[PDB]
Amino acid sequence: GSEPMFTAVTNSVLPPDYDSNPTQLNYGVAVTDVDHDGDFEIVVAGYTGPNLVLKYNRAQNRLVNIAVDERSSPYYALRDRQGNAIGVTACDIDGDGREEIYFLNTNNAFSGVATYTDKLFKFRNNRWEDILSDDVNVARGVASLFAGRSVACVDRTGSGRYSIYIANYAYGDVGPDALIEMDPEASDLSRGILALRDVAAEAGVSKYTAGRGVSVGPILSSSASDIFCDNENGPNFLFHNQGNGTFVDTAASAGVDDPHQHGRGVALADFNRDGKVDIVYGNWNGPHRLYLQMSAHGKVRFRDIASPKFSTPSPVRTVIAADFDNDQELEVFFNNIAYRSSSANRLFRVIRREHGDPLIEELNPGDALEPEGRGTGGVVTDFDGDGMLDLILSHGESMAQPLSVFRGNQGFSNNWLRVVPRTRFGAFARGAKVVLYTKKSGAHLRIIDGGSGYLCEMEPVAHFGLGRDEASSVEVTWPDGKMVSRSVASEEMNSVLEILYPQAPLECGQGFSQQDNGHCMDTNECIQFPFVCPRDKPVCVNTYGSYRCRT
Ligand SMILES: *[C@@H]1O[C@H](CO[C@@H]2O[C@@H](C)[C@@H](O)[C@@H](O)[C@@H]2O)[C@@H](O[C@@H]2O[C@H](CO)[C@@H](O)[C@H](O)[C@H]2NC(C)=O)[C@H](O)[C@H]1NC(C)=O
Ligand SMILES: [Ca+2]
Ligand SMILES: [Ca+2]
Ligand SMILES: [Ca+2]
Ligand SMILES: [Ca+2]
Ligand SMILES: [Ca+2]
Ligand SMILES: [Ca+2]
Ligand SMILES: [K+]
Ligand SMILES: [K+]
Ligand SMILES: [K+]
Ligand code: NA
């Protein structure tokens, strides 16, 4: 409630300067591995100015920009100073195990027609090169001149090669959303011929909307990647993956169309830890939503549980859900833009309860309050590898301000585990679901972020806080449905586990058991008895991960 969660470390780790943290207009931020060396770099969309690629130097304890102003540098093209970048994400589009980097540029346009193309950078011929406008693609209808906002990776058919969802901002009947991916039939990767196509129309997502936020993962799907678009001046879309690379909108039916509000930052999470994916998002000067997935009438239906404080209107941009203090409960961070007046950032803990809905608790964001911050973007990542998530905030639009960097103040003695699933080709498995079964605390769910938070993309890591507890096993579900269950050894606690795509006896913890298919599932205590309920509360009710006894 009262103790400050964050300390600013900007001045020691990323001081305002010309080269690495300029006073400029920045927008989205994405975390990926740019130099294939295992560590993650932080890619910043420069709206007026170069894009930044920040790499942690342990010797100096600094984030240093490696996209230096040097034409001979392999990173030089990434600067794209002429591009007015807003959205960014990174995804392996060609299946080489390395991520490409997409910048949505919005030069001279709020909406409709823009004057400079988006960029999709790939490392080849020993340097980063734009492939959207190269010989192969320039006439293939994949580089267009539209305003837009967020982008996100989508493993559309479970192939392990990503499509990139492009949330364009239409003006009338100009500027539909796009879904860009590799065209295998026109590609020859042995010769570096990477042919792209837009499949938005055939996939069912070619819509004319005021695009804002996007999130991707198994929301209604058990394993396949659905797409949630929180738009403005109209309904949100909840694109249910049909299993054949196509999507059908289900938002109105599911109760998340929210047609009279204007979405910004968005994240997918399981707040009540019932294994069903929930949706949190900010509404621009509107009632922020925390939608728990429920199953009313055998049909799926989301229910808002936002408290009055949580839903208090603000000029929200970035929304992130993460366990900043490793205490097992997710926090939600709101990066507000102080464009007309002071507008403090907000932090809430969402506390799973034994009975009923989670409890929403306002926290003190400490140095991350930033009442004068023009917040435009942000990410979480553990860039220094100490097991505590770090927070980076970008600022811009209406006032040039440097990036800010924060470390957490709380939960140092709590346990943690970080899980990194890989695709069948060795890339970050964006869109994968990771479930951690704890010894006594039930099951925690993460989705690896392919794009979230409005304009951003978080590190490709399922970061679990374990509090005082320990892990029994992990379970990874890839978008294609492959599921791997693995015990976590004692010595693997408080570390990063890599989980490879599949080319010890299983521990499922309390409330769960290994089924005939080899995977952990809920134990039904009500039938697995010596009878569990006492005389005075004799009716047993089975729950996911537990049970309750009532009268
Ligand atoms: C892609 O699949 C959709 C959905 O197919 C239905 O749901 C799937 C999960 C599976 O159960 C299928 O057998 C179902 O048909 C197709 O849309 C359906 O198409 C049929 C045939 O025209 C139609 O009668 C259904 O009403 C459609 N259902 C929905 C929900 O739209 C779609 O045609 C498939 N497209 C391609 C190109 O394969
Ligand atoms: Ca790296
Ligand atoms: Ca690649
Ligand atoms: Ca849930
Ligand atoms: Ca927490
Ligand atoms: Ca850290
Ligand atoms: Ca149970
Ligand atoms: K730029
Ligand atoms: K909306
Ligand atoms: K702010
Ligand atoms: Na654009």
From Swiss-Prot:
One of its GO terms (molecular function) is calcium ion binding. Keywords: Disulfide bond, EGF-like domain, Extracellular matrix, Repeat, Secreted, Signal. GO terms for cellular component: extracellular region; glutamatergic synapse; growth cone; postsynaptic density. Its main location: secreted. Residues 522-551 form the EGF-like domain. SUPFAM superfamilies: EGF/Laminin, Integrin alpha N-terminal domain. Transmembrane segments: none annotated. FG-GAP repeats lie at residues 17-59, 76-118, 254-304, 366-408. CDD domains: EGF_CA (cd00054). The keyword Disulfide bond applies. InterPro entries: Crtac1 (IPR027039), EGF-like_Ca-bd_dom (IPR001881), EGF_Ca-bd_CS (IPR018097), FG-GAP (IPR013517), Integrin_alpha_N (IPR028994), NOTCH1_EGF-like (IPR049883), UnbV_ASPIC (IPR011519). Pfam families: EGF_CA, FG-GAP_3, UnbV_ASPIC. PANTHER family: CARTILAGE ACIDIC PROTEIN 1. This is Cartilage acidic protein 1. It comes from Mus musculus (Mouse). The gene is Crtac1.
